[PDB]
């Protein structure tokens, strides 16, 4: 699309200093070529030019005192990218690398992911360059309070609902919510998601991402007249998402055989399929040791230090941990192993070279993270619904809706790709389904945003 | 009722310059005689005197620029008549004839209609003397933005929820909502109803009015130990309501045999009962040609120019289009044809002379529009519920509730009429059921409003 | 001006049912012909078409209980006509005749009067058809509370500042303010003017109108190389404005020789120039007897029952009481007496026939009320300034500013009339000066309002 | 100061991509060394680290339609840098070069300038990459409305008061204010400064900057036991500031002899000291021709194309136009001419190399722009005071306060420099006086911001 090509060129030039953002825009816009070409009306209202600019960006100062009385200063961000279809929504990330470029990229992607869920949720991302590592509980609390003391004025249950991300878990959410309720003088607990149950959190929230990624894979087996049962899976991390996946895989007849750590990776040809095995992952996570070895020590299974599990022969690869985990180097090993299923779970766990490469492979199935990991945002939307109804749903209710929607995200993505003649391209399909709803909404709302 | 008679006399005199409003009050209050007489307490708190005065009236200036850069000025209205039982609710009408008199009349009636639904909905009406005919899409957009830039401050999801009416459809709602969200800085999509699905609209909303009018007729057959099946129906228009009715009639064993236009009317003894036939109506509507002839041309069926279909012999008459469509002249032809069922669907499609006349006829069944067309406001209440829960209901869910409530509106109306000894007077029955809930609510709330 | 002529024709037709409003627009717009013709740019932005439509109109229900427990229902109004140059400002009128037509007319005129003061004050008018006659203090209080319980949400110190008018004096202002502060939970006493001193009222407020009308007449003598001293004046009423005028006239070397009542009028060739004489007027006002006779009884001066003092030969005529007091019948007597000075003080105390007539008279000086009575709104602006500074000015300060501005209003009016070649036409001059500031402000603010 | 040195090093590294901002911080912080060293307590509360981070940054999307119906998208900014001593305050700049770096730099400097005025004014800056060149009046209006539709929620008379800057003059302010009042539903005219008189603008506002820069120079003559009279001045531009300066210089016994344009510069050994001469500048400005030649054509004075007037021998140099106008190349010519007075008027009209150079010159007097051009922000504070009092001050009042404060800014700056042993260093002196008030305020307010 000449139109699409022009917008990418303008972005590349204007936001040169925001490499992460530029790359994401190109990657996403480049798959919409066919859709845009079918809708000349978009260009007439500068639809794409509007979409690439967040509705609202807020950055603010965050001074806070440590346990020693020393004063520190960090910077807070909230990028409210697109709210055409619901209140803005997206996690908060606390990591020393956070800057505007990164917030925009995660926030642009969030809008597309949120649109796929089929729930009314806009897209946003925020956080701070604050580093929670080595801070006391009390220091994290004071930071969260100082952070919320400015943020509260920009968010709210019908405005912008933040959630957890790297560096922000239940604990940080609890502290931020405590400050919020005190300043605003009311409950409004739907202002954040990822809450503890005692004050409005949803059942299945910890399992959401991992389970949802398996319900998606299941929809893939079905499409391919295949089956999870018997299937072996290579996982990354031993974290929340890894834990949730292993668990549902096990329950489903499949088994993970690997886990990974910054220290290396383990192989467990038996499968991390036991209550004992599975629960221990929570142990390791708890420990705060940060060693995947502990699992091999404990179970007496192979531990290959400083090594990625991407070399093992398995039926399904699911990177559940870090960005750019799979590089060309890892993709080639994956390819050489004749794995048909490549399923991104963690956010951007594959470099673009690696991605194109895997996508060029005619026999493979490559699923993008924005669709596969949608189960977590899906449970965040269910928590907001529960908080608005002022009641709790049962775990069977949440899990059953989770399951039906994950299947729909896969199926709709395939259908969309197919319709624009792209074949079974789950990557473009996700982008397209996500884009269409947003475009419909913006076209109907006129030129205001 | 001397009390009722006195209030009507005061209205007639004070609002002499608002003929439309005066007539509506008389017509409605005059049927409550029996109820009021049973509740002396009403008069002690000047219940009727309060009811006839809207809680709040807002009129405002609306300057806007056309595509040529010329500046135009129209007037905006919102009459918030009664909010005893829910947020005010009612459509917006854009037509050069709009003035306060007309807003008050539609708004007084809206309060009674909304009360019948059994949902928590107050009554209001608004609009502008702006004429959307001959305006570009862009001109309508700029007008909607200018209109909302003042209106937003008077409405809100828990305050006043506007909806479509003459001159205001999905397109205008979309543009007004776009401006609203931008000014308020949040989502709050329950602020308007009749929205597109992409941003919160409900399934069955387009079909709501027409379908609901048929579920009501069905409750009438049942009362009269009769049946829809086999029944033939004379419709008016080829619009949304006509389309929805034909459709559900067909599905139900009945058939419409007429349609109408400003150009005349058509007769199709076969019935507009085919997918082809039915869907074409949407075609004609789309065309923007405004000719019922196109249907006869297309299907090769009779077209009688400049003629109302009220002369054809059918089992059921359903005027689905314009006010004062049926006059004495048309009622006599209807009477002479021995039609037992007279069912108003469009708003005030019968003149009062014609109405009294039909009502004097001992063998007929006359149903008032405020009850029969309640399916549209009913779906607006379901959309508000869905937006508050932050989810969508399925089409089966909406349709099933629609159906049960429409039956209840008929049944409750008959029961009420019967209890005050009025026989099967669906017209007074609607007024009475509507009035009672409102009165209960106002009596309990005291003298504040 | 063809443009001016067209707008008047459109008004006449659209607001046919609002005779009072139509007449005022014609009278005002017709004098701007020359100014409009000098500014073609006005028509390009539909300046006049916008001006004739109030920015915002609010009407609301007002139920209240009397001392006997009976419930009454009145209607409340606030027409916020033009706020281009300041918060809306204008009195509240409680009289059974009040309707929208009358509010619009007084409110359109208010905008022009407020603009002349040179202070930042927009124009508005409001009130109720509530009749304070025969009500107890307690009944007036309950009404004022019920009235404010809705009004508070539409006004505020930086939004709309109401003041007294017919039927609304210090007492009503006090009660409305009491309810306002209680609902809003703060002080904000600049929300109303005409307050008692104990809670923010300004010194000279009772004298403001009457005194200001004399400082204006003084500027007229100066223009005409004449003098107040020796001058005799015919007044109307024995009220606040009459009292203030007599007082300042006396102090200035002049003397009033008449007063009037619904019962007739008195002649006091000595002059109502004594402390005794002057103060008694307050007595009569207090009495609540409503008889100008009491003054003649008391002083043994002529009392001509059922007669207007417009037949007495005096140097200056100042109608200080009621609308359309001076008709053609009275103008002819005035003319026949060779009075050169005709100075409207009360609001619209002259019919239009009478007005044109007096204006056709080559030797006379006719001053319009909107300029002459501006001293009262001027003191309302000074009260708002004092309340914003949170202090009180001395009486010398208020009186001295009052005086300088009244002179300026006369002088600017003459200068303006002169510049458009109209001669010493104080009537058109007022309209023109008032219009120009408003037009400047609207042109600079764009097409929003 | 090791502390100061450390903060600069951190800034340089963290904001590498914001060169303009980095340079400004270094330049300002490096002169505070002596003050910081005297207050160890600052470092204990991370005072400098907090100061270099704006309290709040807002960026937002700005879609707007041109006269042809085409849709454009720009980006809006508001950097609310420091509000310790008053509502944030600072101009809006519309220029295609605008980005966050530039907003931060102008906004950091604004905080120091505003602090010097002695009025309660914080510091901020905002704008858009929108280019007003070649736009119609109507296009600028639509942009201003779209811009304000988001901005209004972040500003307000007690929060953030924007003012004009490059690309934003009375016209843009008028349009933005029009939209603001319409959305907020009240007056609050103190929300912006630089307004037209009709709606609250202050007398002397157009003359403020230029006049104030001359009252400062006068305080310099006094310090140096010298005199303006007889003095000759080289100006840059023929704009507002140049016009105001020439005017007051003339009146004071001095004379400008040069003016400049993008086309070259003119020399008028007589002096641009005549009503005719002076007023023509307004002519040239009006013309929109953008040619300083027109002055030479008109007066028959020398015009040296493509040349800066920095080579002429005069007593005083006052660059009143563009950034980095004076480079090393121009400073050397200035130096070689033995000019003692170097007075920056325009914002950053000298490069840093040039600055250091001039500052190394033992016989010269170099005055920084942040102090010299403070007269414009000073009149903005007086306009806010007038709008809060709801009255206007006379021109003599504004001018007299302007004058006394400008003298004080010079005198306090010298006194401060002197106290920290820096001699007559007006550049460091400005920084120091500005910094001290801000530091006092932040130390007293604690660690919140």
- What domains, with CATH codes, occur in chain B? 1-51+425-449 (1.10.285.10), 52-187 (3.40.50.10860), 207-373 (3.40.50.720)
Inter-residue contact A253 to A229 (CB < 8 Å): yes
From the DSSP assignment, how many helices (H) and strands (E) are in chain D?
Answer: 18, 13
Would you report the helix, strand and coil content of chain B in percent, each value rounded to 5?
50, 15, 35
- Tell me which method was used to determine the 3D structure: X-ray
- Chain D touches chain C, with at least 3 Cβ pairs below 8 Å, answer yes
* Minimum Cα–Cα distance from C98: chain B residue: B14
Instruction: Locate D361 and state its tokens.
Output: 């010159």
Coil vs helix vs strand at D367: strand
The CB density around residue B40, as the number of other CB atoms within 10 Å, is 9
Distance CA A330, CA A323 (A): 13
Three-class HEC string of chain A: CHHHHHHHHHHHHHCCCCHHHHHHHHHHHHCCHHHHHCCHHHHHCCHHHHHCCCCEEEEEEEEEECCCCCEEEEEEEEEEEECCCCCEEEEEEECCCCCHHHHHHHHHHHHHHHHHCCCCCCEEEEEECCCCCCCCHHHHHHHHHHHHHHHHHHCECCCEEEECECCECHHHHHHHHHHHHHHHCCCCHHHCCCCCHHHCCCCCCCCHHHHHHHHHHHHHHHHCCCCCCCCEEEECCCCHHHHHHHHHHHHHCCEECEEEECCEEEECCCCCCCHHHHHHHHHHHHHCCCCCHHHHHHHCCEEEECCCHHHCCCCEEECCCCCCCECHHHHHHHHHCCCCEEECCCCCCECHHHHHHHHHCCCCEEECHHHHCHHHHHHHHHHHHHHHHCCCCCHHHHHHHHHHHHHHHHHHHHHHHHHCCCCCCHHHHHHHHHHHHHHHHHHHHCCCC
Backbone angles phi, psi at B369, to 5 degrees: -60, -40
Between chains, do D178 and C86 touch, taking CB under 8 Å as contact? no
Name the catalytic one among D14, D104, D113, D125: D125
**Unique residue bearing structure tokens 């009407």:** C59
Q: In this complex, how many residue pairs, one in chain B and one in chain D, have their CB atoms less than 8 Å apart?
A: 15
Which chain B residues have any C-beta within 8 angstroms of a chain C C-beta?
17, 44-46, 49-50, 53-61, 63-65, 70-73, 75, 149-150, 447-449
Residues of C in contact with B48 (CB under 8 A): none
Q: What is the DSSP string of C119-165?
A: SS--EEEEEES---TT--HHHHHHHHHHHHHHHGGG-BTTTEEEE-B
B55–C60 CB contact, under 8 Å? yes
Q: In what order do the strands lie in the sheet with A258-261?
A: A258-261, A264-267, A302-305
d(CA D413, CA A274): 76
Contact B279, B286 (CB under 8 A): no
Interface of B with D (CB under 8 A): 65, 67, 69, 138, 149-150, 153, 182-183, 185
Q: Which two tokens stand for residue C95?
A: 């009289």
Give the length of chain B.
449
| Axis crossing angle, helix D374-389 with helix D395-419, rounded to the nearest 10 | 130
CA distance B94 to B168: 6
Rounded to whole angstroms, how far apart are CA atoms B147 and B177? 11
C448·D182 Cβ contact <8 A: yes
Q: Of D210, D266, D269, nearest to D239 (Cα)? A: D210
D400 secondary structure, DSSP code: H
CA A351 → CA A427, B241, B251, distances in Å?
A: 14, 55, 56
Taking CA atoms, B404 is separated from A170, B241, B398, in Å, by 44, 19, 10
Nearest Cα of chain D lies from the Cα of B33 at a distance, in angstroms, of: 44
Closest in A59, A73, A447 to D57, CB measured:
A59
How far is the C-alpha of C5 from the C-alpha of B446, rounded, in Å? 51
In angstroms, the Cα distances linking A334 to A267, A310, A315, A373 are 16, 6, 10, 21
Which residue from B145, B186, B391 is facing A448, i.e. has the nearest CB?
B145
**How many whole angstroms separate alpha carbon D355 and alpha carbon D28?**
13
Mark yes or no for CB contact B186/A437 under 8 Å. Answer: no
The one catalytic residue among A2, A13, A104, A125: A125
- Cβ separation C53–B65 shorter than 8 A: no
Q: Are A33 and A48 in contact (CB under 8 A)?
A: no
CA D446 to chain C, closest CA, distance in angstroms equals 28
A95: how many CB neighbours lie within 10 A of its CB? 17
- The CA-atom distances, in angstroms, between A112 and each of A123, A211, A438, B182 are 7, 21, 8, 20
Burial of B210-220, coded b for 16+ CB within 10 Å and e otherwise, reads bbbbbbbbbbb
CA of A211 vs chain D CAs: smallest distance (Å):
37
B302-305 vs C160-163, strand pairing mode: unpaired
Task: Please check whether residue D386 is in contact with residue D392, taking contact to mean a CB–CB distance below 8 angstroms.
Answer: yes
| Chain A residue with Cα closest to B170 | A444
Residues of A with CB under 8 A from a CB of B: 83-87, 118-120, 122, 156, 158-159, 381, 384-385, 388-389, 437, 440-441, 444-449
Q: Which DSSP symbol is given to B165?
A: B
DSSP state at residue B201: P
**Residue among D73, D74, D76 at smallest CA distance from D57:** D76
Phi-psi bin for B59: left (phi > 0), alpha (psi -120 to 50), beta? beta
Closest CA to B91 of B103, B100, B99: B103
Strands A341-343 and D56-65: unpaired
Output the furthest CA–CA distance in chain A (Å, rounded). 64
The upper half-sphere exposure of residue D442, i.e. CA atoms within 13 Å in the direction of its Cβ, equals 27
Label the pairing between strands D264-267 and B302-305: unpaired
Contact criterion met (CB < 8 Å) for D60 and A55: yes
DSSP-H helix ranges across B253-324: 275-287, 293-299
Contact between residue A393 and residue A402 where contact means Cβ atoms under 8 Å apart? no
Q: Which of D116, D374, D399 is nearest to D247 (CA)?
A: D399
What are the residues of chain D with a beta carbon less than 8 Å away from any beta carbon of chain C? 141, 144-145, 170-171, 174-175, 177-179, 181-182, 185-189, 196, 198-200, 387-392
Q: Which of B104, B113, B125, B135 is catalytic?
A: B125
As a dihedral over the C-alpha atoms of residue C236, residue C239, residue C242, residue C247, rounded to 10 degrees, the angle is 150
Residues of D with Cβ-Cβ distance to B138 under 8 angstroms: 65, 69
Angle (nearest 5°) at CA B139 between B134 and B144: 115
Question: Considering only alpha carbons, which residue of chain B is nearest residue A116?
Answer: B198
d(CA B44, CA B49) in angstroms, rounded, equals 11
What would you report as the CA-atom Rg of chain B, rounded to the nearest whole angstrom?
21
Tell me the β-bridge partners of D356.
Answer: none
Phi, psi of A195 (to 5 degrees): -70, 160
Integer Cα distance of B176 and B150 in angstroms: 11
Q: Which tokens sit at A299? A: 């179970």
| CB count in 10 Å sphere of residue D268 | 19
Q: Where are the alpha helices (DSSP H) in C16-87?
A: 19-30, 33-37, 40-44, 47-51
What separation in angstroms does the CA of C265 have from each of C275, C276, C310, D67? 20, 19, 9, 66
Report which of A155, A192, A187 is spatially closest to residue A171, judged by C-alpha positions: A192
Closest residue on chain C to D146 (Cα)? C448
B-chain residues within 8 Å CB-CB of C54?
A: 59-61
Question: Contact B178/A446, CB-based, under 8 Å?
Answer: yes
Q: In what order do the strands lie in the sheet with A88-94?
A: A160-163, A88-94, A123-128, A71-82, A56-65, D56-65, D71-82, D123-128, D88-94, D160-163
CB D3 within 8 A of CB D86: no
For residue C268 the two structure tokens come to: 């006091």
Q: Is B23 exposed, middle or buried (0-12, 13-18, 19+ CB in 10 A)?
A: middle
Q: What number of C-beta contacts closer than 8 Å exist between A and B?
A: 76
Alpha-carbon span C261 to C320, nearest angstrom:
11
- Interchain pair D186, C158: CB under 8 A: yes
The shortest CB-CB distance from D447 to any of A53, A65, A449 is to A65
The C-alpha atoms of residue C162 and residue C157 are separated, in whole angstroms, by 9
The helix (run of H) or strand (run of E) holding residue B162 is strand B160-163
Rounded Cα distance between C127 and C58, Å, is 11
Say yes or no for a CB contact (<8 Å) between C156 and D186.
yes
Count of CB atoms situated within 10 Å of the CB of C120: 27
Residue indicated by tokens 């399923």: A343
Cα separation of C111 and C83, whole Å? 8
C-chain residue closest to B142, CA distance: C448
The helix-helix angle for D100-116 and D19-30 (nearest 10°) equals 30
Asked if the Cβ–Cβ distance from B183 to D149 is below 8 Å, we say: yes
In this complex, the residue of B170, B186, B391 whose CB is nearest that of residue A156 is B186
CA-closest candidate to residue A358, choices A327, A324, A316, A314: A327
Q: What are phi and psi of D430, to 5 degrees?
A: -65, -50
| Cβ atoms within 10 Å, residue C390 | 10
Q: Which residues of B touch C61 (CB under 8 A)?
A: 50, 53-56, 449
Is B125 noted as a catalytic residue in this protein? yes
CA-nearest of D360, D352, D363, D297 to D327 is: D352
Q: Which two tokens stand for residue C282?
A: 């307050």
Q: Is residue C23 classed exposed, middle or buried when 0-12, 13-18 and 19+ CB atoms within 10 A define those classes?
A: middle
Q: What is the dihedral of CA D289, D292, D293, D297, to 10 degrees?
A: 100
Q: Verify C-A touch: 3 or more CB pairs within 8 A.
A: no
Distances (CA, A) of D446 to A391, B181, D42, D426, D440: 42, 37, 11, 30, 10
Under DSSP, the state recorded for D192 is S
Angle at CA C348, nearest 5°, toward C344 and C353? Answer: 95
**CB contact set of D336 (below 8 Å; sequence gap of 6+):** none
Beta pairing class for C302-305 and B232-235: unpaired
In a mutagenesis test of the D interface, which of B135, B136, B183 is the best target, namely the one with the most D β-carbons within 10 Å?
Answer: B183
Q: Quick one: which of D205, D203, D224 has its CA closest to D343?
A: D224
Neighbours of chain A (3+ CB pairs under 8 A): B, D
The DSSP bridge partners found for residue A235 are: A318
A 10 A CB-CB count for D229 gives 10
Nearest-angstrom CA–CA distance, D204 and A257: 80
Instruction: Tell me the chain D residues in contact with residue C444 when contact means C-beta distances shorter than 8 Å.
Output: 170-171, 174-175, 177-178, 196, 198-199
- Residue to test with chain C: of D156, D188, D196, D199, most C Cβ within 10 A: D199
B106 touches B347 (CB < 8 A): yes
Interface touch B389/A388, C-beta < 8 Å = yes
* Closest residue on chain D to B69 (Cα): D67
CA distance D195 to chain B (A): 23
* Resolution of the solved structure (Å): 2.0
State whether residue B88 is helix, strand or coil: strand
Q: Are B162 and B90 in contact (CB under 8 A)?
A: yes
The answer to whether A45 and A29 are in contact (CB under 8 A) is no
What are the chain A neighbours of D49 within 8 Å (beta carbons)? Answer: 71, 73
* Chain C positions with Cβ closer than 8 Å to D: 83-87, 118-120, 122, 156, 158-159, 381, 384-385, 388-389, 437, 440-441, 444-449
Q: Determine contact, residues A319/A330, Cβ cutoff 8 Å.
A: no
Residue B448 in tokens = 């504040």
Contacts of D272 (CB under 8 A, 6+ apart): D235, D246, D250, D255, D256, D257, D259, D278, D281, D295
- C-alpha dihedral (A87, A91, A94, A100), degrees to nearest 10: -60
Catalytic residue ranges of C: 125
Name the residue among B192, B209, B77, B53 with its Cα closest to residue B130. B77
Q: Is the separation of the CB atoms in D60 and D426 below 8 Å?
A: no
């Amino acid at each position: 699309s000449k139109y699409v090509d022009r917008v990418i060129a303008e972005v590349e030039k204007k936001y040169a200093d925001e490499p992460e953002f530029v790359q994401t825009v190109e990657e996403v816009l480049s798959s919409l070529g066919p859709v845009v070409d079918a809708h000349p009306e978009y260009e007439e209202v500068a639809l794409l030019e509007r979409m690439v600019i967040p509705e609202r960006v807020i950055e603010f100062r965050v001074p806070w005192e440590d346990d020693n009385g020393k004063v520190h200063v960090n910077t807070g961000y909230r990028v409210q990218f697109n709210g055409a279809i619901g209140p803005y929504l997206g996690g908060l990330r606390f990591a020393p690398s956070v800057n505007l470029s990164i917030m925009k990229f995660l926030g642009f992607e969030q809008a597309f992911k949120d649109s796929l869920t089929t729930l009314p949720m806009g897209g946003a991302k925020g956080g701070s360059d604050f580093d929670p590592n080595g801070k006391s509980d009390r220091e994290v609390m004071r930071f969260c309070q100082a952070f919320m003391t400015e943020l509260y004025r920009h968010i709210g249950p019908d405005i912008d609902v933040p959630a957890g991300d790297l560096g922000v878990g239940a604990r940080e959410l609890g502290y931020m919510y405590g400050q919020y309720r005190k300043i605003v003088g009311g409950f409004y607990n739907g202002v954040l998601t990822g809450k503890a149950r005692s004050f409005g959190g949803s059942l299945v929230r910890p399992e959401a991402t991992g389970y949802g990624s398996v319900y998606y894979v299941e929809a893939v087996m079905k499409h391919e007249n295949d089956t999870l049962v018997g299937k072996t899976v290579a996982l990354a991390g031993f974290g929340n998402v890894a834990w949730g996946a292993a668990k549902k895989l096990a329950e489903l007849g499949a088994k993970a055989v690997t886990l990974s750590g910054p220290d290396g990776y383990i192989y467990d040809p038996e499968g991390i399929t036991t209550e004992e095995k599975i629960n221990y992952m929570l142990e390791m996570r708890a420990s705060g040791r940060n060693k995947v070895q502990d699992y091999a020590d404990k179970f007496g299974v192979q531990f290959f230090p400083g090594e990625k599990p991407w070399g093992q022969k398995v039926d399904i690869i699911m990177p559940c941990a870090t960005q750019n985990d799979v590089d060309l180097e890892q993709a080639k090993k994956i390819v050489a192993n004749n794995v048909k299923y490549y399923i991104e779970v963690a956010n951007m766990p594959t470099t673009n070279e690696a991605l194109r490469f895997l996508m060029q492979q005619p026999n493979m199935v490559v699923a993008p993270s924005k669709a596969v990991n949608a189960g977590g945002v899906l449970v965040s939307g269910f928590e907001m619904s529960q908080n608005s109804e002022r009641l709790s749903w049962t775990a069977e209710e949440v899990d059953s809706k989770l399951h039906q929607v994950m299947t729909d995200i896969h199926d709709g993505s395939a259908a969309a790709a197919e319709r624009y003649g792209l074949g079974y391209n789950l990557v473009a399909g996700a982008n397209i389904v996500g884009f269409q709803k947003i475009a419909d909404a913006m076209m109907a709302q006129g030129i205001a945003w």
